[PDB]
Symmetry: C6
Subunit: 196 residues, 6 copies
């Protein structure tokens, strides 16, 4: 398990990515993976069970939790990571397939494929950031949430678990996503400039 | 752990699959595996325990859960993934066995085996999609379910846990399955066209 | 991790097994392993805790569960898998030992060892299927079980958890076991025919 | 991960073990490891929590459990496995060290070391079997246990969890241990006979 | 898995780090990783559930825990470890990329990159130590905490779980962080001295 | 995964350790690791939750547990193992670094480093054994503990969970630590004798 092997695995051996997408984007991806691993089960592990309301009606806790957390932050970030990494995996499979098909018996198509992949990665990053903004306005979470949804009578007080720790990890993940967006835009601009 | 090794492992080294079954189907399979891993235990982990009814009769929770969830979505998708991956595993074992048997001492039979394997994969995809449609009509889950089954008296209100997150992951998995079906049909059509 | 290595590992390099025991039996074994892994802890994870009776006497739940589930399906299938795989492991160790002992300084004894191994595998499959039939008549599980055993007073109503999902997985595992039995019988018959 | 590598790893490359200690003892060790893995957490996972008494005094459950289960079966078998495998590990380290020390610049001492190792393995097997007999007379477990120990007033009825499944696995592990004892005795006798 | 491979992996093959950053810093990093692994889930596993207050108001436990533990020690140390290891990963990726780019067709820039990386590692260590000082003044934790925050009426007594064990592990981790800071300062000073 | 590789990894390739530190100390380390793994989560898993007192005051359980178990046995043994293994890791990194630095362009310094490492390992073993003696006098644990600490009124009866199993594992770990101390002293004496 040497450094050259890991670097080659993360690069995708596409021979078209510059330093800002082969040295920095991979590091940010590793950072996001590590943060998600260390915060997925320890922080958001008991987001459902430790979440309680101040009512006595049965079934109000579940409906309140689903009302205020349509999809938890960790699952949203996992989906974002998978969809962001999908185009890189596609490019890696494309270049491996091209090497295989030329082994049994080209630059421009690979260049266009890589550019389209970076554009799609940027698009997925922006889409997931916008979805996060829609579902959870603001970067901070509050302890008290007032919920008025059936079967809860009138408005009940539900209490979120670990709002501050979740706020800290939200800040970290949003900063990492913003850095990824900036790096992808820089990579696209650099490729366009070098093409012309 | 290089890209060529992973690509060769996913391809099955059958030397008969085109790009739409060697570069795209493997990526969709990886996507489904990753989504199932990140949603199997975090979302559907407490589908039984967090599921409560509004009655006082003992044993009504279990019978209601079994009535409304004959087999949970994650287990159904796991079975679908296993049965879809079975023909690819069979073709890989067949080609490995053929290489071994020719090493100790052919194209048409392998071509027919691959075509039959793709047909069976498409059939399994369609069968599991139809079963999902039968068991759970619609792509969305509801918070309230009215259950009238012994021993629950009359009709009781049971509350599902995380209907919206499960709806999101159901949409993702159904979209992936539809993409797999389309790719399999395209692969079969392309092979038939190239044969003639 | 190439396909040739996995195929050689699953074959046992005994140079006496045909396609129906080197390409198909290994695939069925992998299928059983995967189904057991995906159903061992998710389905049968809370078979004891979610199992409740309708009485108030302490200790009735445990005695009722032990009365109706002498050994759970997952553990029974795990024992069946281990005992079925034991003769294959023995043959692999035998052939490895033979290669080692001939390296420091034969076909008929290996052929007889393989035939005896297949016979013992078939015998273990049949024995475990018969034991499953004895303990749990029928392929289906019921929600209500009437238990009359000390200390439970008179007859109490215990409620099984997820009878339908367990029925589905029981059907899958029994079908796989039947396929294994048929393949083993076919392998024995083919070897006997080729010998004569 | 080939068969020759696994066989060499399990053999210990001591060049003094016959077939009954290089092909059979390793298989029985693998069988015991697999059974212990599949029964360690699923069966004995909730031996403490599902264990309840019929009293109302606080702290009676813990003292009763410690009174009737001084050390649980799984931990006892794990300790037995570790201590039985210790002499084999010692012999493997000895032969590796001898190869290293002869590489930088003998049969009789290795033979005596192997014989002493087999004797110690047999002794550990017998000691652990005798300890199991002392702590838990009989191969079967009972649902009701009558406990009269402070602070429990008079005699209370505690209920064991899954006595029948634990009985089945006890039978399996004791049979495996007996087979190991017989094989070790046979190996010692065979080595002594071949020496003279 | 030899020692040379592990040493090369931990060094980063930057050919500019002395013994006090290639032999000692890696050992301290391994020590911190191991302590964090052995204390992450066993000690801080039930910091939320075992944490209880002496009130009867619903939702007071969660708000009190979030008030006194904005971000738990284990997550803070995990973030510190990730951010401290980020510059080393960046330097490793930089040197791998430089080797790759010179393979398809320099000392001063690598030296400056390594110096900047060590400076940033020291800065992150100091920042996280200061944050730990701000959030949790003192190295010791107390059993009683007096909390007066909505909705808890007046001042309630909350009880932390395992204050002494957490204090011991806090002392260990703070000592390791201080050693890391000292080693980084020594490395910077040594590099500056050798440059001039 | 051969035996020579594992032996080389455990030895540290320091070319100065005799048989009593290269064949026996590594085996005892493996034994301690295995015992700690098989007893860390099964025995000491529920030391906090199954621990209950005979009072009604809230928060008395946590303060009593922290009073009688300042740091649990498993965590203490894990810290002891990490600190004992630290000097061996340091020597391995030192010898790897020396090989690297001589590769790009000595016996006495390595000998002194190894001797100092063995002395420090012995010192850490003795320190941790003395700490264990201070915290938990005697090798045995008792079911009843009388606790008189705020907020518990007067003296309350707390009940430890599995005292006998924990006593057995304490005996095993203390015996292993004593064997390690004896072996380290023997190694130091042998090295001193051979030097003179
Ligand atoms: C479905 C769940 C997915 C989760 C998300 C995964 C996300 C990503 C995570 C992980 C992906 C892999 C990360 C490490 C990659 C290192 C590659 C490397 O260095 O290769 C090199 C070394 O390679 C080897 O010799 C073997 C390296 C083993 C890598 C790990 C194997 C599987 C680990 C299982 C872990 C289980 C636990 C995982 C968590 C459950 C290549 O070899 P080489 O000698 O250089 O080649 C010849 C030299 N020459 C080329 C110069 C001629
Ligand atoms: C029963 C549960 C099943 C679950 C579903 C599984 C679904 C699928 C998941 C996983 C299947 C495997 C995925 C990775 C495959 C990579 C293969 C590869 O790159 O091979 C290459 C590198 O190979 C190596 O050098 C070693 C690579 C190790 C792969 C992982 C080993 C086991 C990981 C255990 C993980 C534990 C945790 C897993 C979760 C519990 C081949 O080597 P090469 O150097 O290229 O060969 C010579 C070069 N030449 C050919 C050009 C001449
Ligand atoms: C006690 C619990 C037991 C559970 C039940 C187990 C049931 C069975 C499950 C698993 C058994 C193993 C399955 C995979 C086997 C692949 C073998 C292979 O391809 O070998 C090849 C590649 O080999 C390599 O280069 C390394 C492959 C690593 C395999 C996984 C290692 C351990 C994974 C740990 C996972 C941890 C998690 C597991 C779950 C906790 C051989 O190499 P080659 O390059 O071909 O050789 C030279 C080439 N030539 C021969 C042509 C000259
Ligand atoms: C502390 C906890 C302890 C638990 C109890 C353990 C009990 C025992 C369990 C396990 C011990 C190991 C069992 C498998 C051994 C296979 C060895 C083998 O085949 O070697 C061969 C292949 O080797 C390879 O190429 C790599 C094989 C990887 C083996 C697994 C690595 C670690 C898995 C981690 C799993 C993580 C999960 C584990 C559970 C948490 C040797 O290579 P070769 O190519 O033959 O060499 C050259 C060829 N020539 C010699 C002919 C010239
Ligand atoms: C996302 C979660 C991240 C968690 C934090 C991770 C933190 C860090 C943790 C871990 C990082 C890795 C630590 C071990 C590195 C050893 C490297 C080594 O010795 O390489 C050598 C051997 O290499 C091999 O032959 C294979 C070694 C396999 C290493 C482990 C693979 C993945 C394990 C998965 C574990 C799963 C469980 C993990 C926990 C879930 C290199 O090979 P060589 O033969 O020397 O090369 C040719 C020789 N020549 C160069 C002289 C010509
Ligand atoms: C942070 C948590 C830490 C926990 C505490 C750890 C404590 C310690 C535990 C573990 C440390 C490692 C123990 C096994 C070491 C075997 C080394 C070996 O045999 O090397 C040999 C084989 O090497 C290979 O070919 C690969 C062997 C893979 C070893 C395991 C990799 C990671 C497993 C991940 C497990 C995941 C689960 C782990 C639990 C979560 C070297 O190769 P070779 O062919 O001999 O080299 C060329 C031959 N020649 C030199 C003669 C020319
Ligand atoms: C520039 C950045 C984004 C590059 C990131 C590379 C990512 C997308 C690549 C590099 C290595 C890849 C992994 C390599 C191997 C496997 C094992 C396979 O069974 C599932 C997919 C999985 C886990 C891949 C997922 C995608 C992956 C993580
Ligand atoms: C075209 C697409 C569908 C190809 C997908 C390839 C799939 C079916 C193949 C590729 C690699 C295969 C895996 C390779 C090795 C193992 C280990 C073995 O002990 C169990 C089966 C398992 C886990 C295989 C399952 C099937 C598998 C995942
Ligand atoms: C024809 C079919 C049935 C062949 C199936 C082969 C089976 C029985 C063989 C192939 C590879 C084998 C595995 C190879 C390596 C190990 C690691 C060892 O530490 C425990 C046993 C274990 C896990 C073996 C169990 C048995 C095994 C799974
Ligand atoms: C004849 C029979 C009894 C032989 C059995 C061989 C046993 C004792 C040997 C073979 C391989 C060995 C394992 C090889 C490697 C490791 C990794 C190390 O970090 C801990 C010990 C451990 C896990 C060893 C334990 C002992 C072991 C399992
Ligand atoms: C001088 C000291 C600080 C050096 C420490 C080196 C650290 C930062 C390096 C060495 C090896 C690296 C690991 C090597 C491989 C992987 C697998 C990848 O999928 C995620 C990142 C991860 C897990 C790396 C994280 C960073 C790492 C641990
Ligand atoms: C004589 C006896 C004491 C020798 C014992 C050797 C010990 C100290 C050595 C041998 C192999 C080493 C391991 C090898 C590799 C790794 C992976 C790394 O990411 C963390 C440290 C870790 C897990 C090491 C810890 C220390 C270790 C276990």
């Amino acid at each position: 398990m040497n450094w050259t092997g890991l670097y080659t695995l993360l690069s995708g051996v596409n021979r078209h990515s510059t330093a800002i997408g082969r040295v920095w984007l991979s590091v940010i991806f590793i950072f996001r993976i590590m943060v998600l691993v260390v915060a997925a089960e320890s922080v958001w592990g008991d987001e459902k069970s430790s979440f309680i309301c101040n009512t006595l009606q049965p079934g109000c806790n579940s409906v309140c939790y689903d009302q205020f957390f349509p999809i938890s932050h960790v699952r949203l970030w996992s989906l974002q990571l998978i969809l962001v990494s999908t185009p890189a995996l596609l490019v890696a499979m494309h270049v491996a397939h091209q090497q295989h098909i030329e082994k049994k018996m080209i630059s421009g198509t690979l260049w266009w494929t890589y550019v389209i992949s970076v554009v799609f990665r940027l698009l997925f990053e922006a889409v997931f950031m916008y979805v996060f903004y829609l579902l959870y306005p603001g970067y901070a979470m509050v302890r008290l949430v007032k919920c008025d949804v059936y079967p809860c009578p009138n408005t009940v007080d539900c209490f979120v678990s670990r709002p501050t720790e979740k706020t800290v990890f939200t800040v970290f993940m949003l900063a990492a996503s913003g850095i990824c967006i900036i790096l992808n835009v820089a990579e696209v601009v650099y490729l366009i400039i070098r093409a012309c």
